[PDB]
From Swiss-Prot, chains A, B:
Taxonomic lineage from the root: Eukaryota, Metazoa, Chordata, Craniata, Vertebrata
Catalytic activity, EC: 3.1.1.7
Keyword Transcription carried by entry: no
SUPFAM superfamilies reported for this sequence: alpha/beta-Hydrolases (SSF53474)
Species: Tetronarce californica (Pacific electric ray)
Post-translational modifications: An interchain disulfide bond is present in what becomes position 593 of the T isoform.
Effect the entry attributes to changing residue 197 to C: Loss of activity
Family statement drawn from the similarity comment of this UniProt entry: Belongs to the type-B carboxylesterase/lipase family.
Protein name stated in the entry: Acetylcholinesterase
Recorded GO MF terms: acetylcholinesterase activity
Length: 532, 532
C-alpha cells in the first residue's frame, strides 16, 4: 500500500489527502523521540523506542506546551499562530507529505517553525506542506521541538537541565530523516532545512554546531539568523533566568538539584504563567528561554565561529521582510494600536527606542535616536512610527542577518539573498504594519494557489515563483533553472553583495541591503557600548 | 574744508577719492592707539596721545606683523589676502570713508577683518569701503588689531602679556569711533560692527564681553561666531603654547618675566617663523594664538554666558557660505590639489577626518566618518571630497554659528539668517572648492559694481541687494525696506528658524539650516567625547 511505510522505528500508516483537485500521501504525527515527560522534563531527548504493529499517522499530533497569545481574542491575524491542537509535553513528532505516486529518491525539505523559541506548532494551517510537496514534487517534512522553559531552561553544569534541549529535539528529528526518509521516497543526501524567525536562527545554529552539520545538505533562513540579539544568552544569564523562574514559583534555590526537582513537580501552565517575569530588562523582541552558548552545542562564541569559518560550508538561501518590527511594537510599545494609524509622538518615539535596545546606555540610546530621526520634521507622527518600525527590524532581524551572510559568504559555496516586500492583499492586520514578520511564509507554502483563500492572480504567480525558487535551490543549490529564459536571481558575492526583491513586480536586483543602518548596528553601536 | 576734520585726538586731513564716476572723502591711517612696540609688545593698548597740527590721513597705514602665505606665489586667489602694505608692529590705525557732501548724523558701519587671528589687513582691495559708503550713504570704518603672538600671546596672571590684547585693540578702535565719529558725520548711537571669520568671531566676542557692549548698536557676523572651536583656548592651553613658543626660540623659561623679556628682544619675523610649531595636534583650521577665556574680557565660559543671556541684547544679522571648508583642505589635507579635481580615496578621507577633528578619540573619529559616509558608494572620489569639505565647514563654521544663533535668539531683539551659495563667475580657485570661505566679502563691499573687475550683471545686482540689506539693517535693525514690494527676508525665530539663500535666483526661504549635522556636532559628538 502507498500509505504503508516500514521504517527503522516500525511501520507507519499514512492517509491520502486532497490537494488542488489531486492527491498526495500524508504521514502525520510520527514520533521521533521518547515523550520528554516527568523526570525527563528539561533533559536531552532520547530516541523513540521501536514499536511493533502499525503506527496510525493519519492525524496531527499534539503541540508542545506554550504561552498562548490572547491579546486579540477571535482575531484571525493572531490566532493563526496559536496552537491548533491540544497542548501536551508529549509533543515530539514529525509530519511528512509525500507525492503520489511515491518517489524513489527525491529532494527533501525539512521545515523548522519559528515563534521566538517560546511558541510555535508544526500543525498550523500556514505550514500545511501538501501544496509545496504536490506542486514542486518534493518530500516535505515538518518537525517539532520543545519551546519555552521546557526546551531551553539552562542550568549549565548539570545534566538534568543543560539547556539547548529544544535544539537537540530538532537534531533528533533531522537524525530520523537522515536514517528513514529513504523509505518515503526521499533522498537523505539531499535534504534542505528551512525555517522562519527562531526557526531561521535554528537553521543557522545547525550550520554552526559540529553535531548537526552532517545531517543536512543545504539551508534556507527566513527572517532569522543564529547571531540575532534575541536568539541566545550566556550560560550566566541562562542560569540567572532559571533561578528567577524558580523564585517566581517559590522553589528551593539551595542547589540545582533542588531547583530542578521543584520545577519538575509543577504543571506546565504554572511555568508558563510566570515565564515572562524573568527578562532582565523592560523590552520588546526579547524572549525568556532561548539557546545558550554552552561550549558543547556551540564550541565557542558565535562571532569567533563565524570569523574562523568554523561551520558547515554549503549553499544557503536567505532573506528578510520589509517591516520585521511592526508586530513587536503593536504588542509592546506605547502609542501603537491595532485599530489606529499609530502616529507616534516624540515622547513615545524615545520611549520605544529604550524598549528596542534595552542593553544600551544613555549615549547608545542617543546614537540610535539620532540615526533614525529626521530633524527637519521631528514631530511627524508617521516618520516616528516608521522610524521605530525600522529600528526594531534592523536591530533584531535585518542587520544581524546581513552580518551572518557577509561572514558566511567568505567561506561558503554559494549565497542567494532576497528582500520580501509584498504586502498580501488579504491581510487582516492594519496598513501601518506593512510587510509583516512571518507573512512571506504563506507564499512559501503556497496558500495563494487555493482560490477560497482570496489572493489575487499576481499573488498566486508570486507564490509559484517562490515555491519554485525554494525547491529548485533545495534540489540543485541554485534557485534558478539552468537554461531558463526567466529573470536570473544573481549570486550574492563578497564583492557585489547583490540581492533581489520578492514581489509581484518584474525582478529588480539591488546591492548592499540596508548597508547604512547595518554598519551602524554591526560596527559602530557595539563599539560605542563597549567603550562607554 | 570737507577733507579737514577736528577730532578729540587732533586735526586730520583726508583725501578725495573717485568712486563709480563720483567722489567721496577718505581718511586713511588715523592712529587710535600708541604704537605697541618695544616694552609695549604683548601689552594692552594705550590711547593715542593727542597731537598738534594736522594728521595727514591720505594714505593707507602699515599692516600688523603677520605670517604671509606663499603657498601659491603670484596667484591672485591667495595673494589678495596677503598684506599689501609694509608690515610693522606700529599698525594700530583705522580708516574712514565719508559720503560727500559730509553727512550730519548718518549710520556707521565698522568692519573687523578676519584671518584666523593670525593674519589680516584693513587695507586689502576687497575691503575698500568707498563703494559701500558711496552707494548706501553710510560712514564706513575699518579698524586694525594685532594678530598672532603679538595680539594673543597669553600668560594669564601677568600684566605684561595677559592675552586678548588684540581684542582690546578692536575695542579701543570702537571707543574712538564712539567718541569721534560725530565729527565725520556719523551717528555714534547707530554703529554696526561687522566682520568675517575671525572678524565675525570677534563681533560675537564684543557682544559677549561686558566692556565692549556699550560701544555699538547692532552687529553682523559673517562665517564666524565666538564659540567656534578654533576661536579661543583655555588659560592653561594659552600658557602652554606661550611657553612652547619660547622653547622654539631658546628662551629662558624659569619665569613669565624671563620668557616675556626674551620674547620682546626678538625681531617680529623670528616669532612668526616658529608660530605654527606650538599647535597641540596635527590639524586643519586650528591657529596658534587666539583669544583666551580669561575671566576678565570673558566673565565665564562662553557656553554659560550664552545660556544665561549674559550678553548684549540687540538685533543681529549673520550667516555662512556653502563651502566654508575647501580652503583649509586645499592647504593641509592629503589628496587635495589646486590644479586637480581632488577626488579623495577612502584612505585620505579618514586621514582628513583625523585632521579635521584633532581632539577626537577613536570612537569619535568613527562617529564622524559614519555620519558623512554613503556606504552604498564609499569609494566615490567626489563624494569623499565633498563629504570632507562638509565636515570641515560644519564643524568649524556652520554648526557653531547655528548653536550661537539659537542661543542668542532666545534673548535677542531680532535675528536675520542667510546662506550664501553663489559661486562668483570670475573665481580663480578651482571648481571643486565651490562657494569659498571669504568670497561673499566682495559682494558685501560691492566690487561687482566695477565693470573692470569682470562680474556679470546678475552678480552686480546681487551685490546691490546685499549691500542694501546690510546697510538697511545697520540703520534700522531690519534688512528689509518698510513698504517695499520686494521679497521679504523673514525674521529667524526660535520656533520657525527661517533663513534665506543669498544668490542670483529669486529669494527662497528655508528652515533649520543643516539641522541634521548640527545636532550631531552640537549635541551628540560632544556628549560622546565626554563620556568616552
Amino acid at each position: 500500500s502507498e500509505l504503508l511505510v516500514n521504517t527503522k522505528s516500525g511501520k507507519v500508516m499514512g492517509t491520502r489527502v486532497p490537494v488542488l483537485s489531486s492527491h498526495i500521501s500524508a504521514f502525520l504525527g510520527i514520533p521521533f523521540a521518547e515523550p520528554p515527560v516527568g523526570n525527563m522534563r528539561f533533559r536531552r531527548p532520547e530516541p523513540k523506542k521501536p514499536w511493533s504493529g502499525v503506527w496510525n499517522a493519519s492525524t496531527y499530533p499534539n503541540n508542545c506546551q506554550q504561552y498562548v497569545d490572547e491579546q486579540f481574542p477571535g482575531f484571525s491575524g493572531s490566532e493563526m499562530w496559536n496552537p491548533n491542537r491540544e497542548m501536551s509535553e508529549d509533543c515530539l513528532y514529525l509530519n511528512i507529505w509525500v507525492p503520489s505516486p511515491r518517489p524513489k529518491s527525491t529532494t527533501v525539505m525539512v521545515w523548522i517553525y519559528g515563534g521566538g523559541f517560546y511558541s510555535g506548532s508544526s500543525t498550523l494551517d500556514v505550514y500545511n506542506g501538501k501544496y509545496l510537496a504536490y506542486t514542486e514534487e518534493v518530500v516535505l517534512v515538518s518537525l517539532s521541538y520543545r519551546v519555552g522553559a521546557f526546551g531551553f531552561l539552562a542550568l549549565h553544569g548539570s545534566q538534568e537541565a543543560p539547556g539547548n534541549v529544544g535544539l537537540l529535539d530538532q537534531r533528533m528529528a533531522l537524525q530520523w530523516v537522515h536514517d528513514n526518509i529513504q523509505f518515503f521516497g526521499g533522498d537523505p543526501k539531499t535534504v534542505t532545512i528551512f525555517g522562519e524567525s527562531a526557526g531561521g536562527a535554528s537553521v543557522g545554529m545547525h550550520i554552526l554546531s559540529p553535531g548537526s552539520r552532517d545531517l543536512f545538505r543545504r539551508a534556507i533562513l527566513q527572517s532569522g539568523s543564529p547571531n540575532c540579539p534575541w536568539a541566545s544568552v550566556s550560560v550566566a544569564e541562562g542560569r540567572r533566568r532559571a533561578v528567577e523562574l524558580g523564585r517566581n514559583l517559590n522553589c528551593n534555590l539551595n542547589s540545582d538539584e533542588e531547583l530542578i526537582h521543584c520545577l519538575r513537580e509543577k504543571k506546565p501552565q504554572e511555568l508558563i504563567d510566570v515565564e515572562w517575569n524573568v527578562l532582565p530588562f523592560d523590552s520588546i523582541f526579547r524572549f525568556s528561554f532561548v539557546p545558550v552558548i554552552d561550549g558543547e552545542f556551540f564550541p565557542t562564541s558565535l562571532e569567533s565561529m563565524l570569523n574562523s569559518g568554523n561551520f558547515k560550508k554549503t549553499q544557503i538561501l536567505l532573506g528578510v521582510n520589509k517591516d520585521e518590527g511592526s508586530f513587536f511594537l503593536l504588542y509592546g510599545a506605547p502609542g501603537f494600536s491595532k485599530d489606529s494609524e499609530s502616529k507616534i509622538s516624540r515622547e513615545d518615539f524615545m520611549s520605544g527606542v529604550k524598549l528596542s535596545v534595552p542593553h544600551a546606555n544613555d549615549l547608545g540610546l542617543d546614537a540610535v535616536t539620532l540615526q533614525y530621526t529626521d530633524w527637519m520634521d521631528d514631530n511627524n507622527g508617521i516618520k516616528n512610527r516608521d522610524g521605530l518600525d525600522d529600528i526594531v527590524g534592523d536591530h533584531n532581524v535585518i542587520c544581524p542577518l546581513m552580518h551572518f551572510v557577509n561572514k558566511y559568504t567568505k567561506f561558503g559555496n554559494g549565497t542567494y539573498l532576497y528582500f520580501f516586500n509584498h504586502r498580501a492583499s488579504n491581510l487582516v492586520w492594519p496598513e501601518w504594519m506593512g510587510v509583516i514578520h512571518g507573512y512571506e511564509i504563506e507564499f512559501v507554502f503556497g496558500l495563494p494557489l487555493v482560490k477560497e483563500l482570496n489572493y489575487t492572480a499576481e499573488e498566486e504567480a508570486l507564490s509559484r515563483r517562490i515555491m519554485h525558487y525554494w525547491a529548485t535551490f533545495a534540489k540543485t543549490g541554485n534557485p534558478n533553472e539552468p537554461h531558463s529564459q526567466e529573470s536570473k536571481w544573481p549570486l550574492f558575492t563578497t564583492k557585489e553583495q547583490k540581492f533581489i526583491d520578492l514581489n509581484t513586480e518584474p525582478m529588480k536586483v539591488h546591492q548592499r541591503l540596508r548597508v547604512q543602518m547595518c554598519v551602524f548596528w554591526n560596527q559602530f553601536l557595539p563599539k560605542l557600548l563597549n567603550a562607554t
